[PDB]
Amino acid sequence: NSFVGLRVVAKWSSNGYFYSGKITRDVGAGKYKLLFDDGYECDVLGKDILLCDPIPLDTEVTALSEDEYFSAGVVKGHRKESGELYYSIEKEGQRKWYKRMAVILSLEQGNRLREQYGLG
């Protein structure tokens, strides 16, 4: 039905990476107001919004560490606990659980998902 309230992964224009958030308002003209999980609110073009919740198994993604580093990996698991989503990310034969908002997509990684999940 409506996109308002749905979780998405959407491009932050300042670095071109896609981050977890929610659509909070239809602002017309192919644009949506997003509330990112980190609290930032701004308008984003539909073409830069991916309607996936969760990011699907086997997707190539980027994971942010608690100490400001990023690395590429592949989604191999999901788990819900206390109303919060966690991703199992595989890198070089090993895995690590990350909170939802620490899993992001580079421009190339988000581009792969646009045809199937993009809103523009």
């Binding site: 932050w12 300042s14 980190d38 930032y40």
Partner: peptide
């Protein structure tokens, strides 16, 4: 009065 840090890039 606090603002989101992502506003620092605008």
């Amino acid at each position: 009065t606090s603002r989101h840090k992502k506003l620092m890039f605008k």
